[PDB]
């Protein structure tokens, strides 16, 4: 529902799946980073019925 | 040293005339969807016609990311507004 929103295109970022590691002794944690995609939805249909 | 070497779109004459406010291929109508692109050197967008097919490209020295994004956005908006199919 974007009735109170302006713009033709709306973006929803995607969230990936994280990895779990073992945390060995005397070893630093592994930092994780993922390049995520996005989902775009457009306002493109304008329908009318008149009389 | 990242350059764009080709930003080309292919249309038919009827659809181009629809999106150029009825004007033919060689020139760009100011009220159309191909006007308003930022000009780094001369005309940023050029159009040519051949065998019923219209080729719309960004000029040689105007092929920055902003022009490409604006051209794609305007093509999408014009196609959706005018019920034209923007095939991939």
């Amino acid at each position: 529902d974007v009735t109170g929103k302006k713009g033709d295109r709306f973006h929803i970022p995607n969230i990936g799946r994280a990895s779990v590691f073992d945390k060995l002794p005397e070893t630093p944690v592994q930092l994780q980073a993922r390049q995520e995609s996005d989902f775009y939805v457009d306002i493109d249909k304008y329908k009318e019925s008149s009389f | 040293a990242i350059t764009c070497t080709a930003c080309t779109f292919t249309m038919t004459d009827a659809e181009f005339a629809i999106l150029n406010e009825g004007v033919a291929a060689p020139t760009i109508d100011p009220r159309g969807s191909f006007a308003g692109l930022q000009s780094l050197s001369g005309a940023p967008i050029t159009a040519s016609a051949s065998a019923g097919t219209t080729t719309v490209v960004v000029a040689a020295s105007n092929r920055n990311d902003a022009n490409i994004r604006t051209l794609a956005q305007r093509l999408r908006r014009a196609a959706q507004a005018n019920r034209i199919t923007f095939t991939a």
Binding site: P13, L31, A33, Q35 | -
Partner: protein
């Protein structure tokens, strides 16, 4: 100089840089418009107006 490679580091894997947050960083329309410069309009003051 801090160029000794015999000590254990503490950074592994990948970092969440602003190039990996491309889908999360938007473009902003602040509401400001850039309007063309207005010309000087003085021609109806140096004529006889009825």
């Amino acid at each position: 100089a801090l160029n000794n490679t015999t000590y254990q580091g503490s950074m592994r894997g990948y970092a969440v840089t602003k190039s990996r947050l491309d889908s999360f960083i938007p473009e902003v329309w602040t509401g400001e418009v850039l309007r063309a410069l207005n010309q000087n309009f003085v021609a109806s003051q140096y004529v006889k107006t009825l």
